[PDB]
Structures are given as structure tokens and as C-alpha cells.
Amino acid sequence: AGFANIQGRADLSDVHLPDQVIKDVLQTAPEASVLLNRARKVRMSSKKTKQPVLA
Amino acid sequence: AGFANIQGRADLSDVHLPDQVIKDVLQTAPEASVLLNRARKVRMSSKKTKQPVLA
């Protein structure tokens, strides 16, 4: 044919028409723990610790 | 005693008469793969690769 030949998106390869990528993941920041910040913090050096109490 | 005495090989130790060893293996020189020599080679960088072709 002579006329009305036109280049469509359907005529090209996936290598001609690639999607753009964003490397940054869409997420919210990780939440910090309640007790690991509110509670008083002590360094243990055995499986158990003991304290005397007035009773 | 007498005149018949001569040293045989059966009279010497395995350390006196050691066998020589040859460290090269007797082997048929390895033919290469057909496809890895004959076919066109490219580096892939993911589980799938795609290319354009004329239609």
C-alpha cells in the first residue's frame, strides 16, 4: 500500500520501549521497640541474676 | 663357596631396585564441546535475557 503506514507502539520490541526503574524501595522506616527504650537497662553476665528484698 | 655365585635381582631390596613413576597421566587429549566452540557466545546478567529481532 501507498498511504497511512504509521509506526505504532505495538510494532516495537520490549528493548525499544522499556519501563524506567526506581531503585529505592517504597516503605516506611522501621519502628523502634517500646520496652528496649522505656525500661531501665542492665548488662547481664550470667543466665540468672538475684537480689535480696525486704519482706 | 665354589664358582657359580652371582648377584640376582631377587637378592636386592625394593629400596635398592625401585620402580620409576611417570607423573603424566595416559589420556586422550580432551575434545572441546561443539556448542561452546561453534555457537556465538554472550554474557547473560540475569536468569532471562531479551533481544529485538526483525519481523
Automatic annotation (TrEMBL), chains A, B:
It is found in: Virion. This is Capsid protein. The gene is 9. The chain holds residues 2 to 56 of 329 of the full protein.
